[PDB]
Design a protein around this ligand. Sequence first.
Ligand SMILES: *Cc1c(COP(=O)(O)O)cnc(C)c1O
Length: 509
Amino acid sequence: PNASQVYRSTRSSSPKTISFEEAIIQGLATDGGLFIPPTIPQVDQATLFNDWSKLSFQDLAFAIMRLYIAQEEIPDADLKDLIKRSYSTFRSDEVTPLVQNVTGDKENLHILELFHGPTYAFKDVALQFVGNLFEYFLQRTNANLPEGEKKQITVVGATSGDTGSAAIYGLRGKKDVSVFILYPTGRISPIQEEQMTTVPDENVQTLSVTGTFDNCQDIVKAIFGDKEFNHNVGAVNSINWARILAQMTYYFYSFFQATNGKDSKKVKFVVPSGNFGDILAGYFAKKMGLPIEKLAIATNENDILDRFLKSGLYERSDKVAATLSPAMDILISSNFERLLWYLAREYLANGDDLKAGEIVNNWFQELKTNGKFQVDKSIIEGASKDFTSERVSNEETSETIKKIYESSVNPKHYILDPHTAVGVCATERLIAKDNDKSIQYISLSTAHPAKFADAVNNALSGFSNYSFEKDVLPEELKKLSTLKKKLKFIERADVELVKNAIEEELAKM
Ligand SMILES: *Cc1c(COP(=O)(O)O)cnc(C)c1O
């Protein structure tokens, strides 16, 4: 392994580094930090435009991943299989198709559709890959056990809506793995529950906890904190390294789609963000050599990131404002820490990986004490060389859905889900003030409109031609309400009960 195929915790001050496999399985680091490659792999322009520009999503995934995963940890054959199977469940031949010049040619507004996977939400790109990864690593281990005493993992977590769907489809049917996901009853919209409870696979079982969602965090954090509950318990996270790694593929893919042939090789990505993982993957591609403009962070009212990038003050809010784009409604952007490590390393530790861990660890300590920390101007100045940000209100979110519906040209009446809207809204603000329409704008569409009907309906009610059922709801998604659900209620937030239900895996899990 080279400096890019080795990993360390953003909070560690030790010279020690672990393997890819270990970073992946461990998930979060013992000290609470996140894993990251101390050295970002460098790809030269020649290779980018002579060899990578001609590759398919899957082949790029291989080229990119070979840079962070050593041959020893995962051979070419095995890795190419993981990729092939991971993306074979995508309804688009391209996996992540770029829809170019949606609004005509007065500007260059491209929408990168990342919702063609099993659950119609962009988290499939990561989770399909990670799930297969887990199965692969767990398998090799057990490949020595004696059909008995063979380890088995059990992922457990709570869902406020969609998040869980992605995990369920990425772990469904994977050998020696089981997924138990708690969710507040009646608090989960129909379509999100249908995706979860519909899947036939046995290794999956959702729990309809009667209570609140913030109730489920504790009714599961307890099971998590453990007790005599040691048998290998998995975790439902957003900070796994494999996640970031999988998400890098489509930035490269779409970049080439937007520039191959064309004379303008200038492209700017606008990414509706929550926990920063998605856009952070774009950061990595940028540092690897992708010659792109500043990455645009688009957020909804929960603007912890927009505020930070503007003041250097990373302060957690008290209230989680409700918005039309729920999946970005967060108090603290978890992966942001990863960026802070690289920032701290370049502008405060003069390259010292270890002083960077010290610095980051103290910052997240101040957070867990004053709920806010200040960074030196050199940090925000360093971040502003690669990032721009925009805050999008609900009014603007809805109005953008309406504007694009009327405004779209290729195709006509293009419907946006609210999360993508937040992004297109920011994308349009940028087109306005960038003063360079030659720039290729690629706005990330993180969810298919059908996943958030309400926002789409309430914004397109004002059109006689609009019909959710005729223009949005996908046939494959229409069958859901008609498939057999596998519910399992748990009345009262009884941690003791959540435990018991989990235990009933009927031996044959
Ligand atoms: C999870 C999610 C987001 C947030 O992505 P991050 O990686 O957490 O920044 C945005 N949109 C949708 C539709 C999501 O499900």
